[model samples]
Target chain A: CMAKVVLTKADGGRVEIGDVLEVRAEGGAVRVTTLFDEEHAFPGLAIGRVDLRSGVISLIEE
Target chain B: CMAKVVLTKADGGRVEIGDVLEVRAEGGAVRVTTLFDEEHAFPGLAIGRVDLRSGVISLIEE
Candidate 1:
């Protein structure tokens, strides 16, 4: 089954619902792409954490 | 500094150019939101990996 997910930025910018396309982890950073033809790039430190119940991915500073 | 990013889906649905909002990590899943007023939720297994230079987050079956 395909999982639904969202990618968010610290500036309150966000992309709605989309299936995950590609994820590359390297140099303490992450690059992401979705089926909606959108791309996201950010530092690993910017990630707040990953949630399950609400199905939300938040971005924040430590 | 705020990082620019994008959220995408496997079905080719996507939202482009948004800032990180929020991410929750629990139950081995993730929920994300962006500045574009978009929200996304997905399973942890859907993520392929995270990259730095390209700034792309990809979702795929492990």
Candidate 2:
């Protein structure tokens, strides 16, 4: 069963599985926003790539 | 805007924003499932709490 989960960043910002309003993949971090007007920046930790068609978000460790 | 983001766990399993089909909050890990039939276990790291009504999954660092 493919499902969605929420990722809480170090800055107390939370991002739902598919609610990425925006993404900036530079500067060693990824900035994301949600449809509910939630915004967050994930730094240091490896970010995942998203597949819109299949709705699969792959978190990379490298 | 409140949008959703995908959280890729240390394992290859991935979860979307609102696709949690199952959850077990014991043993320092949480098991989750998606509507698409995907499942994963998050271990070691701090897990987040989910608010079903608002769809806000808060990651708790402990």
Candidate 3:
């Protein structure tokens, strides 16, 4: 499993170091949650790239 | 400016809520730094999508 998760400036809102994050494909959107289970939504946000085995994901802003 | 950065489970490390992240297009790779200035590297990870004005980036893991 690509268990590692990294965030850039866009999602610097609801997460922190060492805190666990939960992700789910919510229909047309992607949902991320903290250990507190607070949910954040990304609507139609562009994803830069990914590898399921490497567990690498990068959302593009530029 | 695509100032906003979001992470799925792929990039759930070295980042939390509120802390700042700095991104750089570092020579065939992308580098992300935390407010503490710790560096993380993503090399050859495929980017899914992007919006420069909206400032949204989602790194893919799945």
Q: What lDDT would each prediction earn against the true structure?
A: 0.47, 0.43, 0.42
What CAPRI grade goes to candidate 1? incorrect
lDDT per residue for candidate 2 within B1-59, as digits (tens), equals 12232455557666555555444334555455556777665664333333333443433
TM-score of 1: 0.33
DockQ for model 1 equals 0.14
* Model 1 stretches with alpha carbons more than 4 Å out: A1-17, A22-25, B1-62
Best by lDDT: 1
Sort the predicted structures by DockQ, highest score first: 1, 3, 2
The model with the greater lDDT, 2 or 3, is: 2
Q: lDDT per residue, candidate 3, A1-62, as tens digits?
A: 21233446655653222222444333455455545656666665434443332344444343
**Which stretches in model 3 have alpha-carbon errors above 4 Å?**
A1-62, B1-4, B7-18, B46-56, B60-62
Pitting candidate 2 against candidate 3, the one with the higher DockQ is 3
Per-residue lDDT, model 2, residue B44, is 49
Candidate with more favorable, higher lDDT: 1 or 2: 1
Q: Taking the tens digit of each residue's C-alpha lDDT, what string does model 1 give over B7-48?
A: 566587764443545444345555556657786666652333
Tens-place lDDT digits, model 2, residues A1-62: 12233455558776565554443334555455555687565665333433333433333321
For each candidate, what is chain B's TM-score?
0.43, 0.50, 0.44
